[PDB]
Amino acid sequence: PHRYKPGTVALREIRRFQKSTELLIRKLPF
DNA sequence: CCCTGGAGAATCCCGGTGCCGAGGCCGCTCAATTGGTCGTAGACAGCTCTAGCACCGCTTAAACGCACGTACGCGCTGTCCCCCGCGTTTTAACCGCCAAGGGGATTACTCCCTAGTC
């Protein structure tokens, strides 16, 4: 099982967003 | 007791082709310079006047050490509860299908506006 401990992918995924700069909110519901 | 070979998987990175738009080029174009005025407002004293610099001696009011003392931030213990990674499902926009008006241009019939001579 390729299950990582809670938070192991969290730091990576935070890095992924804080690199990005796009719109985080879907336009139609807004 | 704790370290790692192997493996799974995310990262860094440069080819490697397609695209749309940044920048250059063209044609106006309108607003900053500039001539003058004439009179406005601030620089230049100038008289004034007004609060502060330093000084004096007190007065106990705060400031600091010493000693008691005591309880709280922090670090130890344990459990427990609840949120995540992954697996399965369902709203959620997007692009095709159809037959009918709306309309904007677009051209055809024609009809009056225009203008000639026996």
CSV table of N, CA and C (backbone and C1' of nucleotides) in Angstrom, one decimal, chain B residues 39-45:
chain,number,residue,atom,x,y,z
B,39,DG,P,-2.8,94.6,-12.2
B,39,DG,O5',-2.8,93.0,-12.3
B,39,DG,C5',-3.8,92.2,-11.6
B,39,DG,C4',-3.2,91.5,-10.4
B,39,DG,C3',-3.2,92.3,-9.1
B,39,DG,O3',-3.2,91.4,-8.0
B,39,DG,C1',-1.0,91.7,-9.7
B,40,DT,P,-4.5,90.6,-7.5
B,40,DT,O5',-3.9,89.1,-7.3
B,40,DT,C5',-2.6,88.8,-7.6
B,40,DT,C4',-2.1,87.6,-6.9
B,40,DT,C3',-2.3,87.6,-5.4
B,40,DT,O3',-2.2,86.3,-4.9
B,40,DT,C1',0.0,88.0,-5.9
B,41,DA,P,-2.5,85.9,-3.4
B,41,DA,O5',-1.1,85.3,-2.8
B,41,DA,C5',-0.5,84.3,-3.6
B,41,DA,C4',1.0,84.2,-3.2
B,41,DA,C3',1.2,84.1,-1.7
B,41,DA,O3',2.3,83.3,-1.4
B,41,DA,C1',2.3,86.0,-2.5
B,42,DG,P,2.4,82.5,0.0
B,42,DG,O5',4.0,82.4,0.3
B,42,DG,C5',4.9,81.9,-0.7
B,42,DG,C4',6.1,82.8,-0.7
B,42,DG,C3',6.9,82.9,0.6
B,42,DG,O3',8.3,82.9,0.4
B,42,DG,C1',6.3,85.0,-0.2
B,43,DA,P,9.3,82.3,1.5
B,43,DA,O5',10.6,83.2,1.3
B,43,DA,C5',11.3,83.2,0.1
B,43,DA,C4',12.2,84.5,0.0
B,43,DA,C3',13.1,84.8,1.2
B,43,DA,O3',14.3,85.4,0.7
B,43,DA,C1',11.5,86.5,0.8
B,44,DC,P,15.5,85.6,1.8
B,44,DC,O5',15.3,87.1,2.3
B,44,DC,C5',15.3,88.2,1.4
B,44,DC,C4',15.3,89.5,2.1
B,44,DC,C3',16.0,89.5,3.5
B,44,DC,O3',16.8,90.6,3.7
B,44,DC,C1',13.8,90.3,3.7
B,45,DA,P,17.9,90.6,4.8
B,45,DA,O5',17.2,90.5,6.2
B,45,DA,C5',17.4,91.3,7.3
B,45,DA,C4',16.6,92.6,7.2
B,45,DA,C3',16.4,93.3,8.6
B,45,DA,O3',16.4,94.7,8.4
B,45,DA,C1',14.4,92.7,7.7
